[PDB]
Write a protein that binds this ligand. Structure first.
Ligand SMILES: *[C@@H]1O[C@H](CO)[C@@H](O)[C@H](O)[C@H]1NC(C)=O
Ligand SMILES: *[C@@H]1O[C@H](CO)[C@@H](O)[C@H](O)[C@H]1NC(C)=O
Ligand SMILES: *[C@@H]1O[C@H](CO)[C@@H](O)[C@H](O)[C@H]1NC(C)=O
Ligand SMILES: *[C@@H]1O[C@H](CO)[C@@H](O)[C@H](O)[C@H]1NC(C)=O
Ligand SMILES: *[C@@H]1O[C@H](CO)[C@@H](O)[C@H](O)[C@H]1NC(C)=O
Ligand SMILES: *[C@@H]1O[C@H](CO)[C@@H](O)[C@H](O)[C@H]1NC(C)=O
Ligand SMILES: *[C@@H]1O[C@H](CO)[C@@H](O)[C@H](O)[C@H]1NC(C)=O
Lengths: 287, 151, 296
């Protein structure tokens, strides 16, 4: 009898082979309202197990591997480094004799090209076009080493190390974009490499940068067999809607179009046409 | 009028102007106000090329020098040059692929993609007094992004 | 011998300058001459690598100097001219040193301090640039202005930004420090904007049937936009005797980005095909597309 919160997919936890990976037990401060220290004091124990991929048997994790490879430390699970066959779902569970809450997270170890290619679904950090200086930060780096050790961070665009770019300045853990232009679209990689106890590790994150529509051009919706054509200037967290009314609600055919700067164009066919963005709700009638 | 031209001046994103440097060669550099007259005045002929969803096929000729910018191979590498022509014949309407560029123009920021060699662009160098060329990279060491001003 | 670089790069008196040999990258071995130049750095004008150093420069130097790459096989060489200038009275610059730059209001943009590429430190990094506007110094607060490298990133341009700007560095040559000055005239422009051309007429309509008639495409948009006809899913050809296209463009003084584009489908003699498929006008730029027909 557990509270089975299931599988936390708000990881982005695919990970390259031969690299470290720490995972915090997702329970704490998320599923549960408390941290590790409190729960320990509350007489809870934290336990770990997994199911391998192409398997249904919940086995124990092995903590007695060569070089103390997979390690546990409080609410963190440590792989140093990950191997291919580590891929599967890991469960942390907190239990009393009267209490039980568990969740699991996916770990997908993945292989790398010499130029950063992989089946990895890259994450997308959109940048505002022509918008002064904007910065991207090398993701998932905190926890892997103390402030006592200064690593090397190398930035790449494509297969190429970023050195002497026109509007791009690597500033350590931060990559700076000066007045972005659509020329700035692509995959960017950070390779952070550090020493741990007389071994050197490497941490690799790659992400897609897409330059999109400025806030200073964001605007309520613009309206143009009866076509209701509406133009939606790009706004970041916006639900673009379009509907005909007659008074309340013959076929139809929606058609989303996008542009280079992600400005939406919903065309929808067939007496009044409406549109709603995060900046407005308007309507225009028909002849 | 079989095609429309307009007469424009060009600069790159780091504000360098294009001047002609000894013929068959454009170079990009910063210019002082008393030498603004030294700018290559361009004629942007809006030719026919492949319909694109969002590009505009144009040919880039210099103004009464009877030269047009061109894209050809040279040691098996796409290269940008000035071909000379008979002005009674040009500005044609279906221009040969080595004349046509695809204009991408976003908030009045232009880059011209060679139609002959896709994913190649008119690049300038960050350095000064350095000749205009043709690059295989956007977003890197070379500037591929330009501004337009009219005449 | 000679071919002239006839473009007189004017720089600042009492302050260090560097001139390179203006060669297309097919260069050789470069020697500098006056109207040769000393080879030892101590001499206030000299050669180091292949550049002509003025350490510092005084006004008396203004004149023509020569650079000569020689291969025995070839040695035709280039003459360049220099003008040095003391600052105008009550001014931290001189009018004919000014580089003109421009930017659009309501946008964010950046100026560039020209001819700074030679003053880098061994890591190929330049000296912190100090920014000024009309001899008064700038707050690089990263709200209104930011300086990285050779840039002066300016945010929310408005016409108040209009002025002569000054970028300044300090170069160390040989254990004495040297100041480098450049001047930029900031002049504003009309705002940049996402604008898709929009079609006026034809207006998706019928027209009664003839058997040398003209057919008009009116588009409102930029001059860099285009407006063309397609019929039977294909474009008007230069070798189609019935069908002609002539492209005109009326500017607009008021709003240059809202100015008439005109295309005429000069059909001359009808054919029976023309009643069967509509004539579509297309207005298009990088921002978006519009479409309109007339059926015959
Ligand atoms: C949670 O853990 C921290 C230790 O990092 C501790 O300071 C705190 O008292 C604990 N509980 C809370 C949230 O008060
Ligand atoms: C069991 O855990 C529950 C929940 O924290 C707590 O109330 C109880 O005191 C714990 N019992 C023991 C003996 O640890
Ligand atoms: C983890 O388990 C889920 C079921 O909850 C399964 O669908 C998925 O394939 C597993 N993923 C990994 C990384 O093994
Ligand atoms: C990486 O960027 C390229 C463009 O440079 C793009 O075509 C590709 O989709 C990206 N990689 C992945 C796997 O998304
Ligand atoms: C810059 O200075 C020059 C000469 O002193 C003057 O002609 C010009 O008006 C100035 N430009 C601006 C916009 O301040
Ligand atoms: C349509 O274009 C014509 C010129 O062909 C122009 O006179 C007219 O003003 C344009 N339409 C509108 C509504 O301005
Ligand atoms: C005119 O016709 C085109 C198709 O040729 C269509 O896409 C457009 O929406 C029509 N204009 C309107 C608003 O009726």
């Amino acid at each position: 009898r557990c509270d089975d919160w299931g599988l936390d997919t708000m990881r982005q936890i695919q990970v390259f082979e031969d690299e470290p990976a720490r995972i915090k037990c997702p329970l704490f401060e998320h599923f549960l309202k408390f941290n590790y220290s409190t729960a320990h004091s509350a007489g809870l124990t934290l336990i770990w197990y997994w199911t391998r991929q192409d398997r249904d048997l919940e086995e124990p994790i092995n903590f007695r591997l060569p070089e103390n490879r997979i390690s546990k430390e409080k609410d963190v699970l440590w792989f140093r480094p990950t191997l291919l066959n580590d891929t599967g779902n890991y469960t942390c569970m907190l239990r009393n004799t009267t209490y039980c809450s568990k969740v699991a997270f996916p770990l997908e170890v993945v292989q790398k090209d010499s130029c950063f290619n992989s089946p990895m679904k890259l994450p997308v950090h959109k940048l505002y076009i022509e918008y002064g200086i904007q910065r991207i930060t090398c993701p998932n780096v905190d926890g892997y080493f103390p402030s006592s050790v200064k690593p090397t961070i190398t930035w790449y665009m494509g297969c190429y190390k970023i050195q002497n770019f026109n509007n791009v300045i690597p500033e350590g853990m931060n990559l700076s974009f000066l007045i972005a232009l659509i020329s700035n679209n692509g995959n960017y990689t950070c390779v952070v490499t550090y020493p741990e106890n007389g071994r050197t590790f490497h941490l690799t994150r790659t992400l897609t940068v897409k330059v999109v529509g400025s806030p200073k051009n964001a605007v309520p919706p613009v309206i143009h067999l009866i076509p209701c054509t509406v133009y939606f200037s790009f706004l970041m967290d916006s639900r673009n809607e379009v509907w005909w009314t007659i008074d309340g609600k013959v076929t139809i055919n929606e058609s989303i179009s996008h542009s280079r700067t992600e400005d939406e164009t919903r065309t929808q066919i067939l007496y009044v046409c409406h549109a709603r963005s995060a900046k407005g709700e308007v309507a225009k009638a028909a002849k | 009028a079989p095609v429309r031209s307009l007469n424009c001046t060009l600069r790159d994103s780091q504000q360098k102007s294009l001047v002609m440097s000894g013929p068959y060669e454009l170079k990009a550099l910063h210019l002082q106000g008393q030498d603004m007259e030294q700018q290559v005045v361009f004629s942007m002929s809006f030719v026919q090329g492949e319909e694109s969803n969002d590009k505009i096929p144009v040919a880039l000729g210099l103004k009464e020098k009877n030269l047009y910018l061109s894209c050809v191979l040279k040691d098996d590498k796409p290269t940008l040059q000035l071909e000379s022509v008979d002005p009674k014949n040009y500005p044609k309407k279906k221009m040969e692929k080595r004349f046509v560029f695809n204009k991408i123009e976003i908030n009045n920021k232009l880059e011209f993609e060679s139609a002959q060699f896709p994913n190649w662009y008119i690049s300038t160098s960050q350095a000064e007094n350095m000749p205009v060329f043709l690059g295989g990279t956007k977003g890197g060491q070379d500037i591929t992004d330009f501004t337009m001003q009219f005449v | 011998k000679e071919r002239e670089e006839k473009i007189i790069l004017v720089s600042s008196a009492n302050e260090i300058d560097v001139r390179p040999c203006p060669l297309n990258p097919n260069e050789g071995t470069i020697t500098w001459y006056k109207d040769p130049v000393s080879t030892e750095q101590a001499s206030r004008i000299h050669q180091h690598k292949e550049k002509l150093w003025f350490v510092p420069a005084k006004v008396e130097d203004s004149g023509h100097y020569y650079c000569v790459v020689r291969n025995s096989s070839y040695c035709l060489r280039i003459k360049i001219s220099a003008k040095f200038v003391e600052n105008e009275p009550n001014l931290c610059y001189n009018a004919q040193a000014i580089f003109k730059q421009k930017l659009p209001v309501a946008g964010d943009g950046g100026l560039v301090c020209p001819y700074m590429e030679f003053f880098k430190n061994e890591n190929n990094e330049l000296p912190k640039l100090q920014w000024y506007k009309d001899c008064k110094p700038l707050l690089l607060d990263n709200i209104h202005f930011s300086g990285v490298k050779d840039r002066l990133i300016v945010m929310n341009v408005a016409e108040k930004h209009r002025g002569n700007y000054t970028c300044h560095a300090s170069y160390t040559y040989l254990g004495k420090q040297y100041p480098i000055t450049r001047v930029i005239e900031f002049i504003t422009l009309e705002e940049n904007k996402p604008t898709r051309p929009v079609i006026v007429s034809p207006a998706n309509e019928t027209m009664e049937v003839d058997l040398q008639i003209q057919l008009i495409c009116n588009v409102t948009g930029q001059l860099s936009d285009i407006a063309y006809w397609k019929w039977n899913g294909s474009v008007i050809d230069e070798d189609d005797p019935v069908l002609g296209e002539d492209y005109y463009s009326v500017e607009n003084p008021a709003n240059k980005r809202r100015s008439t584009l005109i295309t005429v489908l000069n059909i001359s003699e009808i054919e029976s095909r023309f009643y069967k498929h509509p004539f579509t006008c297309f207005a298009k730029n990088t921002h978006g597309i519009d479409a309109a027909y007339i059926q015959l």
